Amino acid sequence: KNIESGVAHIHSTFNNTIVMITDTHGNALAWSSAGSLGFKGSKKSTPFAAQMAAEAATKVAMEHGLKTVDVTVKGPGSGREAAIRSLQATGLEVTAIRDVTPVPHNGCRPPKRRRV
RNA sequence: GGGAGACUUGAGUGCAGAAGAGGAGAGUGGAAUUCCAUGUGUAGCGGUGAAAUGCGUAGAUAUAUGGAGGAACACCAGUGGC
Length: 116
Description:
Function: Located on the platform of the 30S subunit, it bridges several disparate RNA helices of the 16S rRNA. Forms part of the Shine-Dalgarno cleft in the 70S ribosome.
Helix content: 25-40%
Family: Belongs to the universal ribosomal protein uS11 family.
Strand order of the largest sheet: 3-2-1-4-5
Largest sheet: 5 strands, mixed
Number of strands: 5
Strand content: 25-35%
Oligomer: part of a larger assembly
Shape: globular
GO cellular component, one term: ribonucleoprotein complex
Keywords: Ribonucleoprotein, Ribosomal protein, RNA-binding, rRNA-binding
């Protein structure tokens, strides 16, 4: 109901961007996405859509009560920086930024190349 | 070419060292994917050139914490080595 510090997970893929603001323990507080905001098709990956998604999620989080957030960026999407700037503009203080893109140590076999 | 000898440079042994993803056997480590359980949380997620199929209110994706299991071994790594 009332929080001050939290985490913001930005999942940005080539097709969509999802912003998930949680508490420092990971429990979800608010979230939004390009698709959730009405963007469809290619638009979902545009940085502007990421900007709006971060804006809407931040507004809900601040409404719930939240001042500081630390950012974790995941995925190769092109809207990560747009979301971060949107967070700052909407008001939440960006305490820190880290990248948590998983990096398999070889691990599993990725799917086939396209057009083969 | 044959026979009877001699010789040490080829060949090999000895002695002294060197490096190595060489091979076989038995274990073991972390990353990561998927699945499972339980939290938080609400409407999409996923995907394309564009769409649709598909998954999601039986609460998905995301997110936190665990647990299961299979396979391959990021960085080192290098017309490097064996």
